[PDB]
Amino acid sequence: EQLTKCEVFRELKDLKGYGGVSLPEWVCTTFHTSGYDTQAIVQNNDSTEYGLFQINNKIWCKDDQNPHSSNICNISCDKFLDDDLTDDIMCVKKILDKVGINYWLAHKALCSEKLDQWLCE
Ligand SMILES: [Zn+2]
């Protein structure tokens, strides 16, 4: 699903503030990460990123490409492609626990200064 800036904002309510990170920062990051596309798939030679956040099949989820994935989030990857972001978001809550917000390099580079433009209302 192609999402609008405000749909995102709405659907990441449960991520709001988590690890000190704010929804504009999330909007700004999800945008640069996926262009608000919950079904984006980038399959590289060796790993593959899924969904609104682009979670790679080599650490967090499991797929046919990397069966020796840790599967930290205990979950099949194609679940990060559907329109339901409930599981998408608990995975990402782990990633914050274990690495944190700089795991996404876009955030500090682009989602830190001008958060006004990522607010919904
Ligand atoms: Zn999902």
From Swiss-Prot:
One cellular component term from this protein's GO annotations in UniProt: extracellular space
Disulfide cross-links: C6-C120, C28-C111, C61-C77, C73-C91
Transmembrane segments: none
Compartments reported by the entry: Secreted
The UniProt record lists the keyword Cytoplasm: no
Gene Ontology molecular-function annotations: calcium ion binding; identical protein binding; lactose synthase activity; lysozyme activity
InterPro entries xref list: Glyco_hydro_22, Glyco_hydro_22_CS, Lactalbumin, Lysozyme-like_dom_sf
Superkingdom field: Eukaryota
Its biological purpose: Regulatory subunit of lactose synthase, changes the substrate specificity of galactosyltransferase in the mammary gland making glucose a good acceptor substrate for this enzyme. This enables LS to synthesize lactose, the major carbohydrate component of milk. In other tissues, galactosyltransferase transfers galactose onto the N-acetylglucosamine of the oligosaccharide chains in glycoproteins.
Sequence similarity: Belongs to the glycosyl hydrolase 22 family.
Quaternary data: Lactose synthase (LS) is a heterodimer of a catalytic component, beta1,4-galactosyltransferase (beta4Gal-T1) and a regulatory component, alpha-lactalbumin (LA).
Name this protein carries in UniProt: Alpha-lactalbumin
Species this chain originates from: Bos taurus
Organism lineage: Eukaryota, Metazoa, Chordata, Craniata, Vertebrata
